[PDB]
Amino acid sequence: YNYLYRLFRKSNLKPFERDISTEIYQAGNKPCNGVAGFNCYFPLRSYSFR
Amino acid sequence: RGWIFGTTLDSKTQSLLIVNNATNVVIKVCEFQFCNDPFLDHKNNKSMESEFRVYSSANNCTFEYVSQPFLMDLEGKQGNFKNLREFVFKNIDGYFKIYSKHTPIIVREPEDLPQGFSALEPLVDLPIGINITRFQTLLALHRSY
Ligand SMILES: *[C@@H]1O[C@H](CO)[C@@H](O)[C@H](O)[C@H]1NC(C)=O
Numbered sequence: 001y002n003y004l005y006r007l008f009r010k011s012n013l014k015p016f017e018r019d020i021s022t023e024i025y026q027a028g029n030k031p032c033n034g035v036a037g038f039n040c041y042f043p044l045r046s047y048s049f050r
Numbered sequence: 051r052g053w054i055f056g057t058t059l060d061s062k063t064q065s066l067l068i069v070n071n072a073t074n075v076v077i078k079v080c081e082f083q084f085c086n087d088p089f090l091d092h093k094n095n096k097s098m099e100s101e102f103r104v105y106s107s108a109n110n111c112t113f114e115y116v117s118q119p120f121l122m123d124l125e126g127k128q129g130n131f132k133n134l135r136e137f138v139f140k141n142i143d144g145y146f147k148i149y150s151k152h153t154p155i156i157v158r159e160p161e162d163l164p165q166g167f168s169a170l171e172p173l174v175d176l177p178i179g180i181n182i183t184r185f186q187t188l189l190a191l192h193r194s195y
């Protein structure tokens with residue numbers, strides 16, 4: 001659980017640019033305020049190598 | 051002295067800063083929490099060297115660069131002449147370029163820039179990968195004296 005990756009982001013990245021932001025992504029109109037389950041997802045999901 | 055950059059100027063996004071102490075540039079690409087009205091002290095504020103108050107925290111650090119100051123201008127010669135420092139800041143494809151050129155000025159009027167051609171020679175290139183959307187400058191105010 002030491003290797004993470006990003007799944008959802010608002011827009012595409014520019015070349016050779018790095019992000020580290022950890023903010024809740026809003027797929028729905030209703031705001032999430034950092035804590036929600038519907039139409040709101042945590043941006044990062046971890047790998048799990050076996 | 052000081053050209054901090056940032057997307058929203060807080061501790062949740064990385065930021066830049068260009069601080070020339072007397073002989074160094076101290077390039078720092080780190081996550082900084084910035085005060086409402088950051089400022090510095092021209093006279094070294096005595097100190098020791100206790101002027102720095104722009105940032106109150108640093109969660110992470112990725113890039114560091116220390117070298118000779120950007121400002122080769124010296125005022126120790128005499129007065130009656132002012133500086134004409136010029137800088138162009140261009141940020142593309144994850145790169146940061148700096149161009150600079152200094153010329154003396156004859157007329158004391160600061161109303162308008164003198165009419166004259168100047169070539170801005172390249173100075174330094176930066177490989178950092180930050181996004182910049184807002185611009186802020188800093189000042190050196192030691193004390194009312
Ligand atoms: C200014 O700050 C730099 C940062 O490390 C330090 O090396 C230097 O000694 C300080 N003082 C002067 C006069 O440059």
Ligand SMILES: *[C@@H]1O[C@H](CO)[C@@H](O)[C@H](O)[C@H]1NC(C)=O
Pocket residue numbers: 020109110
């Ligand atoms: C920023 O600080 C938080 C404090 O909870 C820490 O968990 C996080 O790892 C830090 N950022 C990075 C990139 O490590």
